[model samples]
Target chain A: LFETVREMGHEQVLFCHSKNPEIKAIIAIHDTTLGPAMGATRILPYINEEAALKDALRLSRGMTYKAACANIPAGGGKAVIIANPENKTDDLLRAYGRFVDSLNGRFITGQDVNITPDDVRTITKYVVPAPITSLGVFLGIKAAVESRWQSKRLDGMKVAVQGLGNVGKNLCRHLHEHDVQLFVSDVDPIKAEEVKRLFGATVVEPTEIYSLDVDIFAPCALGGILNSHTIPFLQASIIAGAANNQLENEQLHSQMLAKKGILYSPDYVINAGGLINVYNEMIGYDEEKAFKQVHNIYDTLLAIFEIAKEQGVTTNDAARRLAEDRINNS
Target chain B: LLFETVREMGHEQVLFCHSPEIKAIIAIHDTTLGPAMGATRILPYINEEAALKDALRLSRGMTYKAACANIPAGGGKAVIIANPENKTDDLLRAYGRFVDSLNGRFITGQDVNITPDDVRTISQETKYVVGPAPITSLGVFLGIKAAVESRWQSKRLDGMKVAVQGLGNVGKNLCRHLHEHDVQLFVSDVDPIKAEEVKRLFGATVVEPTEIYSLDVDIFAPCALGGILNSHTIPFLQASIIAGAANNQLENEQLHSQMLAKKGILYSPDYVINAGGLINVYNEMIGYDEEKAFKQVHNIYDTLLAIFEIAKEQGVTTNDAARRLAEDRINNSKRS
Candidate 1:
């Protein structure tokens, strides 16, 4: 545990506890140079406490780059509660809010994984909805199309979008406007059927979407879907999507994808529009202005693609370089 | 006050308002088409020189504050030589008589060590008194939001952390607003009870007075005594924005404010953030209304954000930008 936290080098790690509602959590705060450290609280039943503790460190370290690359004056912090997903209650969530409150503004938290926006704001669990996240993914998808086809426009690309969540739903709509053919999949066949009906995207079984003929494979739902097994089946030249912590193991899987000639648009970088939207909403929401700022994801992905092509580095490596440079100086 | 220095600064009057068991000095620093107005404080000053100096400095502070706030009233202040424990209704009545004797030349209300209950007592003998605390706190709260937006382009206070360094009339009230707005609070006060009360009331985390200076916060509200932002405290300061109701917060304006600039900390001038009390009390002449005063107090947000840009563009401290704006307004408000 010490070696892991020391490797990433966090400023503070709080082992928070509450007796009554039975709240036990680890809050890892990275550098606050850009602003106060803030992140979403993830509640998961890890294999062990050490695994949960490691999750807190690396994810917080990942958030530092997410915010820095997004150009928001926010640092990175993450809280992981070692608890059952079914055990969440208002009392437990409010108790967790007290721990964040105890810091007196040092660490801010928002809705994430097991924490619903209502449950969190049942204590300022600000969640800028999934629409904006999808907006960035769309722009990012266009950038990846440009990488292979040498054209910025996305009129005839074929996309296989997995997951029919709001992010996947909205990204399909954007692709529909571009007149692209989309092969979509979701665990719930009803949602996949809805995508098929709405955008005329062909429905693929959840297990079979990997090898579908497509220009891009968009994973808009879960992480670790691109690890050992699926990496071998990815037929798409481009893998760009909106999901948290996409790779099973970032270092190993990123290398596998790079060696396999699949251009990986880093999830945190391409999926940062919701974050950009939060600041916009904070500053007084204007839908036009907020969406316009999300357009930066397009240029950012293209720049990372350039760095990867010229330097022979992985796309994830290039994106981290961009984020690290800003974090170092700012 | 000093009669020689009185006319030196264009003060309209320096009146010694004294009665049995009450000794007070009122300095009307300016009157631009309205009566001079400011708050009053009672303390056991060493001599007339100390009390008079306080009245003069505070009155001058309100003078520019009124002009900068764009309110019609001018600046006036009163300091009474008496201990808080010794304050009696008879003494207050005596002081009220002296205030009424001035015939609307200068109006007054509450200040340091002077509560609104005291103002109500003074109100019986004279209709020339008004008191405010919540409005001042609201202005400071709004000013903080403005500071956050200017520095981080973030207008949301919810989920953002801020450290406030006093829980007095303004600080506690400011914390309430911050809590209501969902801003996470780290707070400190010299009084443990006051600190504890804020934590109980608003879920604020109370730290030691010294530790509040080094907390990692988006904003630091120094609501305590002045000169706290000196070389010593600032060396350990981690806040991105320094703003609160504490007067003369910078011990030496040149050394301290410039140091904040070098450290990239936005210093909201004490004169500007604390002007809410003055603006609130000044509504006495115009039939005071909370909605009316608050509507004007909302301008504090725009005013503070503007000063940040003025300071940034000119390579000056935010304190200098506010001072330049105020003096220019005061200079322009001068005429027959």
Candidate 2:
């Protein structure tokens, strides 16, 4: 059953054994390089080895495309342990440490899952790096902020922000520094209030904020919020935010066409900022390509708006058509 | 530049193109992941991606035996990449972080290359278990020490001890240690006068360690860190510790009893102790079964020892006698 996965992934097979009275237990990865694999090394609280094995393999396979579509050269891979980290036993880690020493370099490992930099450094006698998230968010936020400034404004307009999570908060923060006024809402009332206090930002209810006669509106929250019903209520001239599949139905593109709202094609573009930052790490990334791509977001967004006007269709529809056109042409 | 090596390692199939963004490089022992699989995730220097790849593949394979021989129901695999701490690049790890999010119930990864607590924590986020190796080394070392004590007396043993030092110090040191212990330590000094110390200690004499001293009790130390070099002088040893920390430490164990004195009443044991730590690591591993078969060498040694004693009575190596006996007995067991 598992071999099929390995074959699909394109990895080789290796085996090991021993009879020294002191050693016990074993672990194996069927294929390390499967169409360019990527994963993380994590210590988790799992029930048994089988659970970890399946989890790692399945997760790794997913990474195959997560990286591929994102433009990273890495394919897919994963790692796990049958234990928790909070109050872990030293014995378990030591056994793990020895096992790690056994790999004479085939798959490179880093922090992932529940594992951290401190956790990784322990196994390595020397210094090593950690896989942190803030930086990617920072880079992505910066790119989005720059794009927001160039977006078609209704003669220098007002902006409303929603959902203040990690990416949302950072997005809002970057935009706020540009003195872009916002009407924010979050699932957490406290966070909504906190954003207002920290940035002297205005607040709004979820229902009232959508229909506001604003120049720009950002939906940093739940998906499908921008479906047919929501699009009618949106009074904002331009729509932009880093949410995936904002429009629940693909058919909503036609519905959006009837409205005057300029829907920045949801996850079709901006969300790529996160992937762009990461894609660099894949294929030993070229910074120039990333910079050029990020800088061109404004043009991409403008091109969508232009197509919307010419096609007499919504911006969302134009974005999809443009994407499909490129695929067919290419 | 390094890509060439990696591409070749994969035999130029071109599946993996190499990426800095990936956090873990999970190398499978057998992608087949059949009867069982074991996983060891290694944390390495961020720039040391090349070396980490080596460690992950080798170690993960070790787990097959941990599953097979030790009764741990897992396959063998390893994950190696950069350290996920300190050099925290936001773009790299977040995407790399996605890897651990996929840990399912089949291939369990543990701290074979990374720490257990880390494994404990990382897998927990995705729900995987870390195996026990950190704690086992302590127990394993104790067992090894005990095994050593059981194998020989604490004092002197009679044998022609050969010390072949390429560093030239190894031979002298072996002679020095054995000379004071009352063993007839024979010194193969790179510099002839260097033997003076051992000569005075046990009245030892200088001779090339590789040279056969059949008339004298033989104890050999190819400590010049000799490895594959064994195919040369293996037939000459009278008593073999043949201990040293070098690679490919022995050509092959198949010749174990062939060089035994009982080949004409010779018993020959051929093997090396260079990879002791790795073997010890094997003993300490958990999960996977096939890996255990690779690491268990006690039976091979035991069989060689038993053949040595048996050959003494017949003035022929037990291996030779066993071969003759097997040839004669082949028809006895077959009615067809």
Candidate 3:
């Protein structure tokens, strides 16, 4: 199903298989400039070529439209490599380099999916250009959520974050500094356990974390989680997160509204605070716009919430439509 | 018909309306390296914003693919306005000049259909890049053809017989060449009264020179009237070289082949010799594969003749089957 969906999305797939050490490269160009295109390169241990291509193509096509609607001049394109990083061979990376060479400038390979800065540094030796690390924007997303919450006053509020990765870590640190209690969970028990032990966090099971009674449900994880089965579980007053495409279903936002949950942000708006920073690098780099735009995340968040309520549409649908319109026009 | 065919060829019409003058401007692209999408700019005298927009959109789209195909480097696109030259105001040309000023190192316009020298000169004030002069290669073409024939075998053969008319510079030089060869010729004067006196010099006929075949002749020089190779002329030809170098390729080379089979002489296929000048050009101006093209044409006549003779065995059809195989292979490969 995933393979079919990815293939259907990108419309084409390019595969490179290496003879030595079980290396595989899948570079997918997801519809060149569909209302303009955008894409990201991921390197990780995928089950196989089909798995890698499926994820990469789907994500890249989304990125293209994402950047477009944001009015950023990037086209969607993505590439993925299939190899466990721990067991990664020089030959595997070399073959991956060859695949990167084949894509030319169409897909800017960056660190994603199990790849890190070191891996990107290696790839960049051959690839020349690389994908912008989503971490900075992800970090800014964390900063935006915390900063916006600070403006609202964080006294006596408990924040339950769904993920404990890069943004979640920095975000929890900021919130913790501002005298907010942290209740965190990750698939990695050790990391969650460490946070729980160090900061006296109210660590919960990954499944139960969404339903936890809290002031804010900052879901710093994958999209589509807060829908149907999960919407009933969201007891938080406000929701904000760094993950792109946070809603699995648009109607879930209405469900959140019926439950009186103030969905503060989603991937399309607040999380964009980060990418906007890196996009400035493409041009001569606009500092003033960056400062104004990044800081304007609160107003954007409040605007989304107000617009959704005033228009009587789900916040998810409102954000998605605005972005979609931009994508279509661009 | 032209517009519909252009659309059926996979293009969008964008706009179409009434017009008085015929002008077209195509901007292929704005920037090649930055983005090699260049298009030209032109305007024809016409009514309706629909026509202007239609011309603009069609020309711009043409520019896009042309740039992608590496036909040109500029990439933004073309703009067309509906206006005629005769009724054009200083404001109209100035508007065109404004359009040219917006080029920003992306587009330049010139062609046969539009009188654009002043447009170009004015355009140069802002956007400076321009193309070659009008009819720049025509003089070179006639000159080179004469040079080739003279070098092939010197000393014009006297009394060999030729026909020259039109009184144009090319026709006059051709007459001089024939005179040097001592070839007798029939001259046709546009003025019928003077036609008699001119025919008297070459001892030729001045009446209905287009119909000069009944008299015995070694060569038929058609310095005018392109595409005259019909069944009417096929049976009556008593010429050595069909060398007037007109265009559109003798209508049907196959029909000409049958005529050639009966005539027992060479039809040097006009493009073969005349094309040297065309190649000489596009080579310098566009710098495409024009040089290699010269080498390819070397075998064009040979291939034409070979195809004429190479028939299928038994019931295997020649035109039907051969054309089918050639077209099928080309069509089938496009998907890959």
**CAPRI quality of model 1:** incorrect
Q: Please give me the total number of clashing residue pairs in predicted model 1.
A: 2
RMSD of each: 26.6, 18.4, 12.0
C-alpha lDDT of residue A112 in model 2: 63
lDDT of 2 by residue, A1-330 (tens): 223443444342112221221222223333332233345666566565445545666555544433432333334445455544565544544545544443433343446666566666555221120111222322333333344354322223467777887767776666676666777888778788888888777888877778888766777687777776677777775566666667677665546634554545435455656554554554466766765544434445556556766877765566656554442333
Off by over 4 Å in 1: A1-3, A17-23, A44-52, A82-92, A124-128, A281-284, B1-336
lDDT of each: 0.79, 0.45, 0.49
Worst 10 residues of 2 chain B by lDDT: B9-18
List each candidate's DockQ score: 0.00, 0.02, 0.03
| Model 3 misplaced regions, further than 4 Å | A1-151, A188-190, A249-264, A280-293, A306-330, B1-152, B155-239, B242-245, B250-336
Worst 10 residues of 1 chain B by lDDT: B1-10
lDDT per residue as tens, model 3, B110-184: 432334564455454445333311121232233223332422343345556555444344444455555544667
| Top-DockQ structure, candidate number | 3
Residue A117, candidate 1: C-alpha displacement in angstroms? 3.0
